[PDB]
């Protein structure tokens, strides 16, 4: 209601926390200790002939 | 014809050394085929 909820505050707090841990997905994916959708994905080519 | 026999004898002879030592041959190559093979086999995985 753009002035119900005066803990717009909390939610933001839910929010951020939310974003910390789509940042965790991003790593923890490290299959191989080479974490894959962040950081350091070199546009690899897996040789299949 | 005793000349000739005997020559043409101790020629099959050399002859057959001469197979032996090409048969060893065959299988060292062979074996570096199977080596290289390998290496095929190890550079393919390599792509990783």
Same mark, same amino acid.
């Given at each position: 209601?753009?002035?119900? $909820?005066? $803990?717009?505050?909390? !939610?933001?707090?839910? /929010?951020?926390?939310?974003?910390?841990? !789509?940042?965790?997905?991003?790593?923890?994916?490290?299959? =191989? =200790?080479?974490? !894959? !959708?962040? =950081?350091?994905?070199?546009?690899?080519?897996?040789? /299949?002939? | 014809? @005793? &000349? #000739?026999? @005997?020559? %043409?004898?101790?020629?099959? +002879? &050399? *002859?057959?050394?001469?197979?032996? %030592?090409?048969?060893? *041959?065959?299988?060292?190559?062979? #074996? @570096?085929?199977?080596? %290289?093979? +390998?290496? +095929?086999?190890?550079? %393919? #995985? @390599?792509?990783?």
């Amino acid at each position: 209601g753009s002035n119900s $909820d005066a $803990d717009r505050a909390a !939610l933001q707090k839910e /929010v951020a926390a939310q974003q910390a841990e !789509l940042t965790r997905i991003s790593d923890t994916t490290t299959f =191989g =200790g080479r974490k !894959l !959708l962040d =950081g350091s994905f070199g546009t690899t080519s897996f040789q /299949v002939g | 014809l @005793s &000349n #000739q026999i @005997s020559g %043409l004898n101790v020629a099959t +002879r &050399n *002859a057959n050394d001469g197979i032996s %030592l090409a048969q060893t *041959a065959e299988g060292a190559l062979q #074996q @570096s085929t199977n080596i %290289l093979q +390998r290496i +095929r086999d190890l550079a %393919l #995985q @390599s792509a990783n």
